[PDB]
Design an enzyme around this catalytic site. Sequence first.
Site, PDB file in Angstrom:
ATOM      1  N   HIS A  20       0.818  -1.445  -0.597  1.00 54.00           N
ATOM      2  CA  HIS A  20       0.335   0.003  -0.081  1.00 54.00           C
ATOM      3  C   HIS A  20       0.476   1.298  -0.296  1.00 54.00           C
ATOM      4  O   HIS A  20       0.797   2.189  -0.985  1.00 54.00           O
ATOM      5  CB  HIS A  20      -1.197  -0.431   1.544  1.00 54.00           C
ATOM      6  CG  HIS A  20      -1.718   1.350   1.508  1.00 54.00           C
ATOM      7  ND1 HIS A  20      -2.826   1.042   1.195  1.00 54.00           N
ATOM      8  CD2 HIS A  20      -1.290   2.396   2.011  1.00 54.00           C
ATOM      9  CE1 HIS A  20      -3.538   2.758   1.696  1.00 54.00           C
ATOM     10  NE2 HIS A  20      -2.375   3.009   1.908  1.00 54.00           N
ATOM     11  N   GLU A  21       1.741   1.240   1.068  1.00 53.53           N
ATOM     12  CA  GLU A  21       2.945   2.202   0.575  1.00 53.53           C
ATOM     13  C   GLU A  21       3.691   2.458  -0.331  1.00 53.53           C
ATOM     14  O   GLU A  21       4.053   4.039  -0.979  1.00 53.53           O
ATOM     15  CB  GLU A  21       3.436   2.233   2.679  1.00 53.53           C
ATOM     16  CG  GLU A  21       3.155   2.088   3.508  1.00 53.53           C
ATOM     17  CD  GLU A  21       1.993   3.782   3.319  1.00 53.53           C
ATOM     18  OE1 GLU A  21       0.945   2.748   4.546  1.00 53.53           O
ATOM     19  OE2 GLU A  21       1.664   4.217   2.525  1.00 53.53           O
TER      20      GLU A  21
END
Length: 201
Positions: free
Chosen positions: A142-143
Amino acid sequence: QRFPQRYIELAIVVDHGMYTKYSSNFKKIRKRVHQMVSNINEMCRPLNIAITLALLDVWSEKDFITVQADAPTTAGLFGDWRERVLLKKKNHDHAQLLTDTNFARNTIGWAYVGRMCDEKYSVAVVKDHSSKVFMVAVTMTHELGHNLGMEHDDKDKCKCDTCIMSAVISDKQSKLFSDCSKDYYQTFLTNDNPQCILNAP
């Protein structure tokens, strides 16, 4: 493939709190990190990005930055240390700091948007927020996604409710990127197209 081949050489840094959490056992920590990378690699397959672990640094003595409650603040300190120190050890494209820190507001990760390859901003901080390797790897992915120009999924733009870029994680978390995410990645490759990820190891 919908996307042209790209490569991301990752550096993963395990902080001292996480080292302590895992019984100060380097072997155990390395194994967990490898399993995380194998999951990030699997999740990036539909984007045609080959993920490798270029470097693992475990802070077995002490933290070299102040890993604090505000994740964005921690990320800025980590980016500074990554540019000044980590990049001098071995070149890599993006670095993530794994920590057991109880970030504020139940936050589990943070990264700069669209700064993949930048010496200071191609970084993320991620909380080791689950005993389940997959759940922490989804957060790392996600990051990474934010760093590849992705914003959170939006229902008007795409229908996936539990994809990688959902604003908040949940038990029904899917290993897939939504069409919102794939479209953001296309925009990033068209408008930014950073050189370091064009380079195979």
